[PDB]
Design a protein around this ligand. Structure first.
Ligand SMILES: NC(=O)c1ccc(C(F)(F)F)cc1
Length: 338
């Protein structure tokens, strides 16, 4: 009943914000631009500082015209509407959003510890206790998101930031969607795609649990289970039903992974009648105190090294490009609700 009433309140609070989303809660000239932290085909993320409060934030800037060209309108609308409505210890918080003639802006908490991707590549692989600590946070986060009828659809090490306490904060809801039943969009990163996405089926929250299997494998081995030079070759391996495990994997880890990396979605852990409890009660998680993790009372495997809230040393270097705002409004109608 403890978990039931927690998720009931979580859904109540989500739905209230979902039905009446916040809009236009800051503007660009409230901030100073510090550094570009990441950059993609239709957007980038910049470290900014609020000029009145002095607080740092990570500002995600999406070019409206590129979003339209790359067919991400609904996706960017999803991202902001979901982010302004959710609330969970392991999700990066949205602080402000707004738009102008050219761009959409999402101003979120800055997490100076960097991406799990960087730390995993630096150290090679995480021990199983270390992987398990991160994995438990993803399990709780998906339990929360799925109870809200949300699918995340972009789990990968680059999207998991490590905060000042060594805990996970999930960033980038660009593919997140509220889904009752099934959904159909081809999206994600090739290494993490579930078989039913590759095969163009109507799919559901089970694709997140598949991706957790990929993530756990990659954290514990140092490389993902399905690897190749071309995506087509990655896809052949994903749909094949075959996965090889390093000998150093524990038997418990291999057993959990076989049940998360189950190509038949109707037999995949997290998509059975017991839902998330098949994962939470698995022997590989026997040492996990789920409440202590939620409450952030467990000592973390490591604390990122950084000097303060404005330190960018854990992120990498990108060409610094203008934030140009056109004199004329672009795509006003498409992004009315933003
Ligand atoms: N919320 C953050 O602190 C954050 C930092 C960096 C990125 C990156 F995508 F650019 F890497 C995204 C988000």
């Amino acid at each position: 009943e403890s978990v039931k009433e927690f998720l009931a309140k979580a859904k109540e609070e989500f739905l209230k914000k979902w039905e009446s989303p916040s809009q236009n809660t800051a503007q660009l000239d409230h901030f100073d631009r510090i550094k570009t932290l990441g950059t993609g085909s239709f957007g980038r993320v910049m470290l900014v500082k609020h000029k009145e409060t002095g607080n740092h934030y990570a500002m995600k800037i999406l070019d409206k015209q590129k979003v339209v060209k790359l067919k991400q309108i609904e996706h960017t609308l999803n991202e902001k509407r979901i982010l302004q409505a959710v609330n969970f210890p392991f999700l990066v918080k949205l602080e402000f959003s707004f738009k102008d003639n050219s761009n959409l802006y999402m101003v979120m908490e800055y997490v100076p510890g960097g991406e799990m991707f960087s730390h995993l590549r630096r150290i090679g692989r995480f021990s199983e206790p270390h992987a398990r600590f991160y994995a438990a946070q993803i399990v709780l986060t998906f339990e929360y998101l799925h109870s809200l009828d949300l699918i995340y659809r972009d789990l990968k090490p680059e999207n998991l930031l490590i905060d000042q306490q060594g805990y996970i904060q999930v960033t980038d809801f660009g593919f997140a969607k509220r889904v009752k039943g099934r959904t159909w969009t081809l999206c994600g990163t090739p290494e993490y795609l579930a078989p039913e996405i590759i095969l163009s089926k109507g799919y559901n929250k089970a694709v997140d649990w598949w991706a957790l299997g990929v993530l756990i494998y990659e954290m514990a081995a140092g490389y993902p289970p399905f690897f190749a030079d071309q995506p087509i070759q990655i896809y052949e391996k994903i749909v094949s039903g075959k996965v090889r495990f390093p000998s150093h994997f524990s038997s418990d880890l291999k057993d959990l992974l076989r049940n998360l990396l189950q190509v038949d979605l109707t037999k995949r852990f997290g998509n059975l009648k017991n839902g998330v409890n098949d994962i939470k009660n698995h022997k590989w998680f026997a040492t996990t105190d789920w409440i202590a993790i939620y409450q952030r009372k467990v000592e973390a495997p490591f604390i990122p090294k950084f000097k303060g809230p404005g330190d960018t040393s854990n992120f990498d270097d990108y060409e610094e490009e203008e934030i140009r705002v056109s004199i004329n409004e672009k795509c006003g109608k498409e992004f009315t609700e933003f």
